[PDB]
Amino acid sequence: IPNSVYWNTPEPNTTTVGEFEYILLACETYQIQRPHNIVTFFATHDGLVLQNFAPLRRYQICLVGLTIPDFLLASVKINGDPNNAEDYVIEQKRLRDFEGLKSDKDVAVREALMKFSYYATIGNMDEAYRCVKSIKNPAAWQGLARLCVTSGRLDVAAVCLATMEDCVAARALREAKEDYPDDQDVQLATLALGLSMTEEAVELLRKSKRYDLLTDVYMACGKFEHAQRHSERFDRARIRPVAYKYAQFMESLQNMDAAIMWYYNAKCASTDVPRIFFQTNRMHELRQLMMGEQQSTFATIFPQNRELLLWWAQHSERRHNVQEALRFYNAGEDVYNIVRILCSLTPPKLDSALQLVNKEMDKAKMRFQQQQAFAATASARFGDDDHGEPDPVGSAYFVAQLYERQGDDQLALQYYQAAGAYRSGVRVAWKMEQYGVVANLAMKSSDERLMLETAMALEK
Amino acid sequence: VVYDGRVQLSPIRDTPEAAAPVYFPESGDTRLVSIALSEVFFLYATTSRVSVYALHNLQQVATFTCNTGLKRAFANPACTRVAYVDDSSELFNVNLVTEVANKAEGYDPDQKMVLWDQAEATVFITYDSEKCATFVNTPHSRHGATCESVLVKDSSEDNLYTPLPPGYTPVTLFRGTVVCQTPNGTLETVPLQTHNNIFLRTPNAEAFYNNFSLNRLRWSSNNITSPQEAEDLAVKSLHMLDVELAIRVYRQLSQPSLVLCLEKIRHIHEKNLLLGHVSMIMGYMKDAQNFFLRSSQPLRALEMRR
Amino acid sequence: EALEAFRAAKWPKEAMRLMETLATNSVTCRKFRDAAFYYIHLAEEYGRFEETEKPTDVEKAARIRRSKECVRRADIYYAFSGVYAHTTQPLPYNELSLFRTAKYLFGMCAESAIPINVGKGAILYTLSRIANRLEMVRTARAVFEKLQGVILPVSMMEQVDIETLLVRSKPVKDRDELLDRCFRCNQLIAQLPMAGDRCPNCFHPCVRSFVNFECLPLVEFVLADELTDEEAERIIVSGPFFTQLQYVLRPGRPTATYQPFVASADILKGFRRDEVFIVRPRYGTLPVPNRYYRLMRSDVSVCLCNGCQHFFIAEDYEAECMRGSGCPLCRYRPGKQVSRSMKQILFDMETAAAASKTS
Ligand SMILES: [Zn+2]
Numbered sequence A: 001i002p003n004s005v006y007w008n009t010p011e012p013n014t015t016t017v018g019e020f021e022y023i024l025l026a027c028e029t030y031q032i033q034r035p036h037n038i039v040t041f042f043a044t045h046d047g048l049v050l051q052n053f054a055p056l057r058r059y060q061i062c063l064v065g066l067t068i069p070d071f072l073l074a075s076v077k078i079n080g081d082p083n084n085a086e087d088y089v090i091e092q093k094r095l096r097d098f099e100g101l102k103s104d105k106d107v108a109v110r111e112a113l114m115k116f117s118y119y120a121t122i123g124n125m126d127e128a129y130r131c132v133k134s135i136k137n138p139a140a141w142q143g144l145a146r147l148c149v150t151s152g153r154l155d156v157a158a159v160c161l162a163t164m165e166d167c168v169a170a171r172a173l174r175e176a177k178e179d180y181p182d183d184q185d186v187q188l189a190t191l192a193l194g195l196s197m198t199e200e201a202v203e204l205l206r207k208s209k210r211y212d213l214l215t216d217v218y219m220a221c222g223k224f225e226h227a228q229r230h231s232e233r234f235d236r237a238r239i240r241p242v243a244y245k246y247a248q249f250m251e252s253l254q255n256m257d258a259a260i261m262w263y264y265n266a267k268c269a270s271t272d273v274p275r276i277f278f279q280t281n282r283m284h285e286l287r288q289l290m291m292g293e294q295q296s297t298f299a300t301i302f303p304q305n306r307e308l309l310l311w312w313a314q315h316s317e318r319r320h321n322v323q324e325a326l327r328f329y330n331a332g333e334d335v336y337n338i339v340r341i342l343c344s345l346t347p348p349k350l351d352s353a354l355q356l357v358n359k360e361m362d363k364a365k366m367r368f369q370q371q372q373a374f375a376a377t378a379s380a381r382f383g384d385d386d387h388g389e390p391d392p393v394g395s396a397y398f399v400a401q402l403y404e405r406q407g408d409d410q411l412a413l414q415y416y417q418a419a420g421a422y423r424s425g426v427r428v429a430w431k432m433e434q435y436g437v438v439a440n441l442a443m444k445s446s447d448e449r450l451m452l453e454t455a456m457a458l459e460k
Numbered sequence B: 001v002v003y004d005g006r007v008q009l010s011p012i013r014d015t016p017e018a019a020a021p022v023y024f025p026e027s028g029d030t031r032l033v034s035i036a037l038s039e040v041f042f043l044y045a046t047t048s049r050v051s052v053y054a055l056h057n058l059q060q061v062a063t064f065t066c067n068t069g070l071k072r073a074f075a076n077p078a079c080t081r082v083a084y085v086d087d088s089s090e091l092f093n094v095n096l097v098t099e100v101a102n103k104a105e106g107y108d109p110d111q112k113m114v115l116w117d118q119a120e121a122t123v124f125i126t127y128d129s130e131k132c133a134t135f136v137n138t139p140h141s142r143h144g145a146t147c148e149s150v151l152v153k154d155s156s157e158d159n160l161y162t163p164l165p166p167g168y169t170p171v172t173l174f175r176g177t178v179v180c181q182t183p184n185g186t187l188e189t190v191p192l193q194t195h196n197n198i199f200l201r202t203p204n205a206e207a208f209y210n211n212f213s214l215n216r217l218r219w220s221s222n223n224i225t226s227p228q229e230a231e232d233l234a235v236k237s238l239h240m241l242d243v244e245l246a247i248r249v250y251r252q253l254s255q256p257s258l259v260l261c262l263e264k265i266r267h268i269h270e271k272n273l274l275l276g277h278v279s280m281i282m283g284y285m286k287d288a289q290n291f292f293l294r295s296s297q298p299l300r301a302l303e304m305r306r
Numbered sequence C: 001e002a003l004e005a006f007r008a009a010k011w012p013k014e015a016m017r018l019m020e021t022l023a024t025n026s027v028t029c030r031k032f033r034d035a036a037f038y039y040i041h042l043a044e045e046y047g048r049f050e051e052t053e054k055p056t057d058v059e060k061a062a063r064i065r066r067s068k069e070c071v072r073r074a075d076i077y078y079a080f081s082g083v084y085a086h087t088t089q090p091l092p093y094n095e096l097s098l099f100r101t102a103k104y105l106f107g108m109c110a111e112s113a114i115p116i117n118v119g120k121g122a123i124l125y126t127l128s129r130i131a132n133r134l135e136m137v138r139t140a141r142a143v144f145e146k147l148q149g150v151i152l153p154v155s156m157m158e159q160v161d162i163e164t165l166l167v168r169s170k171p172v173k174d175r176d177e178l179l180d181r182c183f184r185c186n187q188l189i190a191q192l193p194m195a196g197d198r199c200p201n202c203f204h205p206c207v208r209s210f211v212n213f214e215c216l217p218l219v220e221f222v223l224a225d226e227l228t229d230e231e232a233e234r235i236i237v238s239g240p241f242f243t244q245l246q247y248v249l250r251p252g253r254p255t256a257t258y259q260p261f262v263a264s265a266d267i268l269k270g271f272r273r274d275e276v277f278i279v280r281p282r283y284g285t286l287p288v289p290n291r292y293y294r295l296m297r298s299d300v301s302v303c304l305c306n307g308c309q310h311f312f313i314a315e316d317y318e319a320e321c322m323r324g325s326g327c328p329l330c331r332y333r334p335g336k337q338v339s340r341s342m343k344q345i346l347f348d349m350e351t352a353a354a355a356s357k358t359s
């Protein structure tokens, strides 16, 4: 509901005021301590074109006059007394599109800025571009760029950015154009972000989905505790980057507690929690954990983290502590490393290696037989010669190597085939003066080189 | 050992298989001033040159020639950085790896003795019998490697008035504490005025400013009390090519476009590229152009100029 | 698992988006092996279009460029994983492999752009330390003097300075057995290679393995314009250069662009069948010509992972395949088609329910 209307009153003894500057109308409105708004219109022949709204604060009591570029308000002091009748001081609130007015005698710039505001309200920004060329105040360029955001024109907006020498925002716009050429809404969002207006990025492509970019924006505003709770319910594909970014944020804050717990929460404790402990020279505490009320939280999770067990096993293995490595590998059930260690030791503990290799062959056979028997129901009527094979066990490789070092090459060939080492299989098969095993292993390799050379190997 | 103006280097455990002691310098034209010894480096400063030798083989590795002469030398405990006073009563920090001398700004030659901190390798102190001042050397800022005395805030050149407390005899520096060998023989401890409150993470202006002036920026981020301090820390973190801290500070400062720009360059370690990107962000396009030009990615000034 | 299911059931839009998110997560969380795998298969996915849409040649080029870029990123990240692990994690390594890995990383980080979370500082520190340890003193000095123009973490420069000053005392004599050999120019590589890991002498890119990064005896030659890849395969199936190779090294040539060898029909007739390798870049359904390589020293066993089309040493690739993830880069497993038996995922979820219902 309005209360009063006001035209732009020209200044006393100032007859050089522009024509369009005479036609701007300001209205004081309040919604149904009430909100206050001041709304601006251009009283054109075609009707009333709305320019902009302007909310007023609690101390801003009302509007008394308009004199461009200022609403003249008989307000009270922010810390003053509204009950006081004597605290009625005038405030010249700037027009929203009259920012950066360094000179109060700036006449041509003010007139061309008013013309630009009129043309922006009309909208067809092609000559609104020329409305500001006379102006060298960069605030006019910023307002033009905001208009370019609201409209959706970017070739003007690139010049709008690059004439203010905002090389950060121009770089962002160029990268958005280069990487996302099909989508223009993302480039508009990048431009809006470079213009220090941030609520628009979600509103741009809210439900048509761009959850990753708004997650990055939510992080970039320092609102981690908003981004993580947004992504937990709404964007499940990027919980780990939010946790990792918060962990890096805490590490740069020199708070190893939260940094370590969030590097745990990001499922990157295989490489990053040991990084922090090793680069803080806190390796004694890590050894203590691997082999205090707040330490309960750490010790609840740390000793049984399978990735941590595996990393500590590798660490002690390369620290020339073979037996502690074996202990931690068995605690982490990494079959391949255990078999490698056992086949590497002097003496090579061959029987336990064979037992673990055959246990994994047993599990692989179980999976292959389960899938084959599951598939054979429809293969009862459908005759299929699907010569599927169980997943070969890589850990068997070392075992064959042991027989490869013991002259039991006939035994080694079986484990090489069980490992999938077709090249090592034919390497073994050479010395038997055998060719059929060579040929069928080459076929089973299913790689062109393995028959491509064994062809003329057989021809000689 | 220094006798007759020459230094003999000899093994301690006299064994027949041990080699003969050697004598330095090789040319007697230059009078020796000071020496220092590390586990692997033998450093001696004449009035002309500072020379370093590898103890395992005794070959010259670094030889920085002081054109303005040498009056005194003070080598860092690792025998790589030498704070040396020439004949002109000015102090120069010398990195012997790059053989680069930097003028110690703010150096008053009243304090003629220099002691490196035994914990932090980027802090030393200049003292006389009366008082001491603190110097921090940054290995890489946007202005290259620098060395500046710690100054009082709201004081660009001078430091605070110092009515000298009597009797104190500074002897050694460690973590901002000066071990002073008293005449009585006991070792008093004097905390540095530039290292007070630097171990509290509560909001306090003094803590932030002291850790700010010592290039302990990441620590100083815990003691921020006002956004003015925050933006100062952001500018300084960009200044010394610390991208990660720049992102960390700017996350509070609500400048998301800058944060998303910095996150693309937080990984590059070449110094020229970081200098160019940081100068462009700060707005120094001209310097950024030549920084990119002498870099390994020259085609970035082109995209900048477009 | 969702990505694998999308890979099985076409629908390239959602597979594209999910693979972007996964590769980005691997890069930002520094899971460089995961990022290398995601990018090398993302390049292959960039040739996948819906059957309802037939792209223009413009879109085919706009996706071929991204396929090649993602192959390059995958190579860089896979190479950089071990170097970053050595720099940060307290784990030893293989000396020669890490040395050649850092050498290749230098050859690929010189003028081309740098992928995210790849640091030149780690590469230079690693190469310097290993070259010092492996008595590669000249290269150690070169990397050390280059290191001053690269910043480092706040707790590294002490040992860096000590090693820079210490290596100056050591004599400058590099061993020739640890130096890369460019077989095209038939000359060793003593200097640091330029961008693209090309030869210092004849600008030839190094045909390297991707486990230990050793320059395999392979030279790259492109067919002449009157021959095509189909015609090349036809003439390979159906059927001096000593004078020619000398003219290649003649002075005055433009030294800002690589000049590959040119293949004619008669030289392909004279070529032995085992001495030619054909690389078909698996970018998807996009048309990309097949590259051709010549092998002259048969004493070294080379192979090519069909899922990845990268060169490896055959025994080294076989040994690395035993880690339970196929090829170390693309995780390709032979003996089965591209579309696996995805019922394995259903049994895995069955086993997960079983482990939940154990107690
Ligand atoms: Zn060459």
Ligand SMILES: [Zn+2]
Pocket: C305, C306, C307, C308, C309, C310, C327, C328, C329, C330, C331, C332
């Ligand atoms: Zn592969």
